[model samples]
Target: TVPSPRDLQFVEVTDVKVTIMWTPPESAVTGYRVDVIPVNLPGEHGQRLPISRNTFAEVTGLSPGVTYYFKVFAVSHGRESKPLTAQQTTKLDAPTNLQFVNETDSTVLVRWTPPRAQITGYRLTVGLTRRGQPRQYNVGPSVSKYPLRNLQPASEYTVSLVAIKGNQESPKATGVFTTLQPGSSIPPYNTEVTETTIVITWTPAPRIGFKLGVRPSQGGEAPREVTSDSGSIVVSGLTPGVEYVYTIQVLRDGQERDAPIVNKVVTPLSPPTNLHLEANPDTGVLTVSWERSTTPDITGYRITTTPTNGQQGNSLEEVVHADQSSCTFDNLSPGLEYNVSVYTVKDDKESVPISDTIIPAVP
Candidate 1:
């Protein structure tokens, strides 16, 4: 006769594994069979593994944050006893790729990637200490990023991420970040540049205000004040080849709140002018010329000629030295009209093309 196993229960649990223990039957048996099944999943069968009579067994490769039911049965010569059943749940795993997205004198934004397991929510903690005590916030699973506000300027804080499922909390993933000084906190902004203007855009922290100022680098005029609630401003009337500097200051009650953060920007070169074209009927040759830009940054020029009747893939191009404003092209189909465009090149930037049309006369 096969006697049933005794005192079956789980001893240890982790994100992806569990350990179960049980007492052997009083009568000797051939071995034992252990089965595990997910508790809430339907249409899903359990797993069964043969165990040589043992007091405890470790089950691996389980899903995180899931409850599973386990059973053990004592085996005799060729038969088994009534099964002993128990339930266990693995703990949730920690979040990954935790880092600071943005930081200022009084604010820090942190974000992270979620773990592979299903999670109910997350817990965030921020503090000046390693333990991160007394600054805990409970957030739903949908909130993978958050901002800590009203912090001290020039101070450092530690942050942590913990995943939660049911009543279990996973281990914490900790990181540290610093805030800039209050008077100097300048959150970064994006810049869009053109030949005569620069557009700056930025988002301010919640409930905070800001003042923006733009000035020419050559100190021609006092910095100009610009305002917009949408967190964007355009500085125009700028010289095409001059550098400009800008600053942003925190605002409170129509007063400047802190020292401003400053940065510089430069506009691009002006396009080439006076584009001229000539053609020689006898040699089937064409000459292209253009006036160089006055920006003083010109390195060279590019001339591209495309036959109106030919496809783009067959267009011809040539580079002319900065000192020389003209170039010639041969092997032109006689009497074919070509659209020629000339552009000035300066440090990887090109001007709007100066274009014209020319026809090599068929003699």
Candidate 2:
């Protein structure tokens, strides 16, 4: 039995040399028309194909991965067939090389380009710093930069980026950074400063003749006189790890005075220890971390990286500084060998050098 007359319906869909072939009812139809509609499309209607005898038309200018719905109706015997609906989706376009930038100290700017195809919007994920930890926050929208303010100082952060266009989502990219520390001015001096030895070095204090006397670390006795003049002076054999309150008084007449020009300095007891090097084979990066000595006067640490056994058999060295315990060295050549050492620098002088660990750069 023949089926009852119905509205136009989609029979089949196939790709033929960049064209689509549709199978509709052959109910004495003089011609047929095909309508193409993008699924989830808003604010507008779909487009229609011209009536044709061939029943197949090449649809050009259609981007891949965009799901498209098609409806076909038969026109014959002075009447149009009832409409039937079927859906066919297009291939999606992929995005590439998405990156972001720092807009300011409090905000990070993100940007990405569409994949040369139809796209609608974007989505983003942000991470917040908490008590020195990171917590994630998800925000989806069409914004480029998110103002991640009201966060604590010295916090860490990271962001993930994703793009949305016509129901397709692009790959995600991530970036990370840390916030600056927040604090005010605090005079870096201690009251326990007992026998302080201030290296009174002024445009080379005249040492042509006469003697120099270093004040007692106890701060009560007069400066002991010395013959011959030298720019450098080590008030050594002093108490170790004890803060000494001191003032440098020069020998002008024949004896040292109780006061001349007072500058406070604290002599360190034990220098920094446990200076070591760490090499990351994956990134060819080297890092130095060390244990801080009990001395409170430590200014910074000096890091040196040199070739232990070089082709010329000579050590090529590089020195870096860090106010803290650790520092990261980057941009190293892969598969190259390195020997790194660390030194504790106090008063602009390096402590005993800590030997390096030999390592081969990883590929």
Candidate 3:
């Protein structure tokens, strides 16, 4: 009895080829033969495709959009069985909107919109941010997003995408992205701040840079930019005890994020100095004095007197107006040690206090 090919089918149809598959017969068959007849021109005579022992065969050189007569047969001992016939299949189209998402220091996710054509999968190509022998991957149509891993830190990479149907691939669709740099999430910290300036520092990404900008709280002006490749920058000529915003935008592949990542700090006020007390020996009367603050913003002083042992009567506090540099506590208890402090007040905020510890010298 002659061997018969069963369940012959066209598995994939690309622009120039058709992948034909069949089930082997119960009878032992030597090989399977595929014959392709172009419906357009090659009149009358059908062309024999490559002979292979496997049930799968690829019939190639078919024109795009042109139907074909696909034939399959099982051959046993140089004898051909009865043939099975079918008709088959597109030009390639590139994927659209190829972009990267969910990027990190050493990994990235890529996704895209499928082309408006038939495709079995996509051929993904990746390389350095330059030209070299590229690495490639084949992903099926079941996924539109793909994750790539084990990349370099703070480095750039180029990605190429194309729609693939079997042996055919579309023209390349291109995209590029850079991995995040060192300490990308953490903003700059203020290293030093004074009445007239603020200094900040951060770890710059290797071979990359950062942007520094400012928008004072008092002024509603646009944020200005300072560009240089380094780890630190100083903002000068700031007012004493004023808050200012310093924004950090990390440089990534020569581009920056849209929103400004802001860090804030304040230039401190100069507190009053030379804190002293005048004590009336037996009456327990104590007078508090301090040198005025260096800045004009200090309009008043808050004088608080506490106990060194902290086990005495209620603590006393009073305000010294800007006109007077000293205030008095008329009823300091003789049993307690007086610890006095003076803080310069501006608006409702106070500067760091200057304090003095005085032991009772009742004679």
Per-model TM-score, in order, reads 0.49, 0.27, 0.40
Q: Each model's C-alpha lDDT?
A: 0.71, 0.47, 0.67
Residue-level lDDT tens digits of model 3 in 1-363: 566787878787765457888888889888878877656433212345546898888654344444667788878878888887777753565665465542456666776766644678888988788646668998897787798888776766788898877776777777766665643453333245566665656666665566777667677445567855577877666666666666656666667753344445555677788888888777767877878887565657767677776443345456557777887777566646767878776643456789987765665
Give the per-residue lDDT digits (tens) of candidate 2, residues 170-282. 55555544543454211111112222332323223443322334454556544554443454444444543343444334454345432232222334335556767667787
Maximum-lDDT candidate: 1
Q: By lDDT, highest first, what's the ranking?
A: 1, 3, 2
Better of 2 and 3 by lDDT: 3
TM-score leader: 1
Ranking by TM-score: 1, 3, 2
Per-residue lDDT tens digits for candidate 1, residues 109-197, read 67676765677899898887533454888889877678788877766677788988778788887776666775664556555667777
Lowest lDDT sum, 10 consecutive residues, model 3, at 40-49
Q: How close is candidate 2 to the true structure, as a TM-score?
A: 0.27
Q: How far in Å is the alpha carbon of 133 misplaced in model 2?
A: 18
Collision pairs in model 1: 183-259
- Using TM-score as the yardstick, the better of models 1 and 3 is 1
lDDT, candidate 2, equals 0.47
